[PDB]
Amino acid sequence: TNPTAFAQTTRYVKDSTEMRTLVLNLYRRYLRHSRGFVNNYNLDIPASQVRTKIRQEFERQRFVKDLPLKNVLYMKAQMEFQELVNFWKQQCHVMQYFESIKGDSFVQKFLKGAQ
Amino acid sequence: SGGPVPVFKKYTTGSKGIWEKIRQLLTLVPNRSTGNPLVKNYRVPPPGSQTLKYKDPVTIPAGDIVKNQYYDRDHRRNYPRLVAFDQTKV
Amino acid sequence: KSQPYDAYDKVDFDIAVGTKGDCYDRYLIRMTEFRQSLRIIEQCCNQMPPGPVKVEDFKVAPPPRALMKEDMEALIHHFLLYTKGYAVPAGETYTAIEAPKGEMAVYVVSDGSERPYRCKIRAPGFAHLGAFDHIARGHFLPDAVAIIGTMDLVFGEVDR
Amino acid sequence: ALRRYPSGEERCIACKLCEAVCPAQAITIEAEERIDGSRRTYKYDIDMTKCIYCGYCQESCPVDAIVETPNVEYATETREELLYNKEKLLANGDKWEQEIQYALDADAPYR
Amino acid sequence: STKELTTARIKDISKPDENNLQQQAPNRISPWSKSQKPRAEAQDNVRFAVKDLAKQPRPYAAIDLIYKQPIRYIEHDNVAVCDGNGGAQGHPKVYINLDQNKAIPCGYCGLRFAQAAFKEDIES
Amino acid sequence: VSTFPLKSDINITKSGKTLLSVGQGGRSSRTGFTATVFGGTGFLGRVVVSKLAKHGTNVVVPFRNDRARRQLKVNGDLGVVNFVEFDIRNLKSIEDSVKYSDIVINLIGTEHFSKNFSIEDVNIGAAERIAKAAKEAGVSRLIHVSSYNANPSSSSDFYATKGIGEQVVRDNFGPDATIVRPAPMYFRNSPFLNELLQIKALGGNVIFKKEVYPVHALQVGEAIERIAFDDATAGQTYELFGKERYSKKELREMIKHIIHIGYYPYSAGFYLPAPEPFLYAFALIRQYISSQPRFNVDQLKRSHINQEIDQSAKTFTDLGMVPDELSEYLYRYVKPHIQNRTVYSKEDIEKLRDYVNTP
Amino acid sequence: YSSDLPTDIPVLSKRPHTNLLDYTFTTFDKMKNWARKSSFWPMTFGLACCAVEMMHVSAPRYDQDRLGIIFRASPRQSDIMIVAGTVTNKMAPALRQVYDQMPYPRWVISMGSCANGGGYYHYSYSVVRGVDRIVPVDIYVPGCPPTSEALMYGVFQLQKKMMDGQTHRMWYRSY
Amino acid sequence: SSSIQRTLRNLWKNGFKKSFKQLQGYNDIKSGRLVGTDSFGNKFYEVDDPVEIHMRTRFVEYTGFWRQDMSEVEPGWHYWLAYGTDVPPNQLKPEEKSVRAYPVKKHVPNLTYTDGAYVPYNTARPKCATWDPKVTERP
Amino acid sequence: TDLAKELVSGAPKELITERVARIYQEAKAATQSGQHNTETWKIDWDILNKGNRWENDLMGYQSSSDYMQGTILKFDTREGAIRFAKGQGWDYYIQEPKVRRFVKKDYSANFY
């Protein structure tokens, strides 16, 4: 048995610095395929926004301190890339990923039932 | 044993008369049944028109009125206890 | 044979073993398993005994309707069996049978309650489909169709 | 189908057993004391698109109020027509009472 | 009217009509439970706009039917035994006590049992 | 869309009906209303029915084309979208389309006439009879839809009947009837973006000189939602259109580059110039030979009329919605008709506009 | 303008035949619908245990082919989509894509409790509670699984509906 | 059961018009002893032909000509037709007939695709009753 | 434990921001005298101020948008429940069970 395309071994890193090199490397790999993501997924937006929204999700996890949290967020980091490259997700999923979208006043939420 | 069986010993519809002799002259294996069940034998008293009056079966030790205390045959509560042998007990 | 269960130890039947590990061998073994089934089926028709078909234990088996409508304790057990259920002593198990597809097994974890705590189902097709890559390596598209059929992939079991 | 006694009274005493066995949770029962004091149900639905046609409700009924008629030819154009409420199920019990007796007489002793 | 058609009563007031589609049941006008939705309000809905109300299911109300039965009267015994008149195809066997000077209905069937000595007062 | 189509969960109508909504606004929720979208099987009806049923508002959809209405039901939960067979030459059916409703919408209209209906019978007779019956059926709110140049004095038959249609509604239903006058609505499978993409456009120079303002069909659908659910819009007239001015001749050419279609456009018949007296003649013949709605005589007169904005009416800023420009939505509605895929943003489309007009 | 709009014209399914050109378009409807009813070619969209009963309809005992029913493996050659089995979330976008690729006229049948309303898996995290949330469904076959005769009753019911269509008389009268 | 002799004998026994109807809906020419007619009007036959295959010894003759609906078979006979019982519902013992205390009308077939299709509704009243407002005036 | 384990669970953010869980031990029921359901600690989520239950118009069902309405967790030690709640970063609040006060009961007390 052989692994599929763009696959990677799952190793639990033990050094903080080692992970960031993998994290930074992976970021361009997302950026490199951005035009192909638009072409393969027939996205209605230019590739510029595709590169735009990739960067934001990396920063969302920037400030994690404990190491065991760092690996799992990197293990799942690779998996989402691998599925995206190999055209495994359908066009419906990718559109809805980038098609996502100030809070109401207290009276307004109160008026319509709030939460 | 599972030896070959003459066709007229199987519960399927089979030809009679001149056509039986034709059937035996032309078939490769003359003892092969057509597979159409006998109308006069297969399911003839349907499941809803039987004659057997069913009675609930009860073995004596577990269905008796006497010598039938439940704690004797209460196996669900006599289950083997779970014991783990650590290194210390070994 | 390894763990005989449910009267499979009483009847006499043979098994067929291949030698080439190819689709033609598995075709022959299945056609033998047809005739060994027809050999067991006859014996069960001749050796069928009389008696209860279920445990004579109304705390795990519903009482007969006639006894339910006439005996007070039957009505209590009929009531608690169909609403509360029956409790299973705590522990766990791994029970395997010779399913027609292969070895099918369940890993049920009990907690002393009336609902299983865990139930993992080991479907033969799921373990077969993993080996598809290791087998199909070096074959043509018309040959893949044979390998799927020789595996017996009903995908309800694979995608349990 | 929901059945009746020969006298005409509904067989179900709103005991809610069938609702608790039902593996798919296809049954919805709402009950109270009737106008004359009887323990009767005023709401009884089966989500026929959620039932798995498994026969547990039939086995658990203490008074044989809920059964499964041998009918299979009732495919509907809209899915709303497959939400049988108490009016619908009692109309089936009247329609198929003779055929239910055919099956009950035959398979009474085996249960 | 809509006064009887929307409130439950032990007994009706006017004679029921089988053709009147607004009745709760073809043999009873008013509903027989406090929480039962009236049939007039139930069919005053958008989903019935283009339907044929005469062909919707209208089973006969079981409350009116069961009170058309005669009262069983027991002779020289104050306890009645009822089983649904089907044995293994009826309800569980329940014993009814008839000491009180009234007809005690069966819990399952709804048949009313009394004593013979009490019939004259009961039939008043 | 969003998550809740209302501003409050209790809404009292003109008729004293108190409608209480339940749920969070998803599929299983309800709003308590009950609309009736006429011509819901039409182009605009499908978007309007979808938005109402998406939030649990019961919608009665009168139909005549049995198959065309089937796809309407996917938008609503069980029992939400209801179907009533009807014909505008039948009154009983219309009196059942509006029997239980709390909102009546009238999208029925035509720019072509047929052997069984004329433009006079449809844009005027139907809308009148709907409003007369919707009033006698105790409906609190009526919303009507007309053309973008409703003017009873127009020599064109479409705007002659559309303009009179506005009057006969308020003269039948009363001074509460809202009115919507959308601009040419562009969307997937829209009648407007179709003839711009059609290859063999006979008489192209005659037809495509007409100037209009683009408008999103979804915004028209969402605008109709805000109007029905707001009682402050009763008796108000809305003129819905876009900001930037576009001409079909500009669009038919800007589209041409996106489609990427030397010798071929001339040989394939993309350009089919025609003397006008012939077009009046051929379109005359197809009125009684073709069995399908072809580009007829009355539509020809409209090509001589640019869009007019009745500045005394209201716009999207009254509804607090920003109108959507065709720049950002032209591309995604021509992908069906469309190395690296060539994607046009707002900047790409506007630059493409410059190239068409540059000699 | 002037519009003399009657009120008493019956709706199309009720309109009696009056002139000759009604029968001419009715005959073109019957001949067209009779062919579509008789060449009832479904699409092999079996997903789970409901598909086993679907194959048994084609078995010798019931023999769907004797009625002109031939299962086709492509949307191009199929006009009936039979949803036989559970529609999961992961399968849902594919089901819509396969549905869109069927040329008109097309009908969809929902077989069994999973397709109808989720069935046994109604409260699962990965099951669509009714395929009518994804595609329009023309008839619902109830059961788990529906018997082979129950599926044939659903097919027979749909054919009775297809023979009731008036696609061409609609143009002459409703249009 | 497929030979033209079996079709010839059944063709002659029935006569033209009975056999022409079977040549229109049944697709097969059969003849059998009449057992009974149900409330809708369908007639149920039984086949005595020694060559008829296992599941084809009973059949129906629907009332209509161009159309047949399986829901038109009365429930009593629906069980007999499926080889579920040996006693037809017209030969029932009086101690086996169902006792109905309500009038029984003509059989109603499946009403889907019509206006008679059943409409579900909630049979329970709302669970909260809002205040019936009254105004009282201060002294 | 100390880690923000919720960042790997994939749970929606609203369980951290918008919902409140409760750690409690089920109380003894008045109707029955059994004392076994009150020996395991459980976690349940508070209901929603609107949209917890509403009547379905068509069939009178009980519709809900709360995806935690039928989720009850079981534990065997109080600490394990609190530790697990801490691990997920849940905004919980603990309900201390009442303890019945001992009172000796004597047969002879009916006269003395």
Ligand SMILES: NC(=O)C1=CN([C@@H]2O[C@H](COP(=O)(O)OP(=O)(O)OC[C@H]3O[C@@H](n4cnc5c(N)ncnc54)[C@H](OP(=O)(O)O)[C@@H]3O)[C@@H](O)[C@H]2O)C=CC1
């Ligand atoms: N870009 C656009 O589409 C523009 C359209 N408008 C106007 O909006 C209104 C809605 O049209 P739209 O949805 O966009 O596209 P359509 O022209 O396809 O909508 C027409 C609707 O009216 C119905 N209709 C026509 N004649 C009859 C009739 N005798 N009986 C019953 N129904 C009839 C049609 O029913 P059926 O489908 O079954 O035939 C259809 O639903 C029209 O009046 C149009 O002039 C104004 C500005 C822009």
Ligand SMILES: CCCCCCCCCCCC(=O)OC[C@H](COP(=O)(O)OCC[N+](C)(C)C)OC(=O)CCCCCCCCCCC
């Ligand atoms: C170039 C092409 C060549 C021709 C192609 C052939 C097409 C096949 C024909 C389709 C038949 C069909 O469909 O017949 C069945 C259909 C559908 O009947 P239904 O749906 O039950 O409604 C019809 C019955 N009613 C309305 C009463 C309920 O009509 C019929 O019952 C027709 C009944 C009258 C037939 C008169 C025929 C006159 C003689 C014709 C020959 C001399």
Ligand code: SF4
């Ligand atoms: S047969 Fe249907 S309704 Fe009855 S218990 Fe089984 S799933 Fe529930």
Ligand code: SF4
């Ligand atoms: S089990 Fe029988 S008696 Fe009990 S609620 Fe169900 S139908 Fe009624």
Ligand code: SF4
């Ligand atoms: S409805 Fe029943 S038989 Fe059909 S796919 Fe679902 S579980 Fe299987």
Ligand SMILES: [Zn+2]
């Ligand atoms: Zn009784």
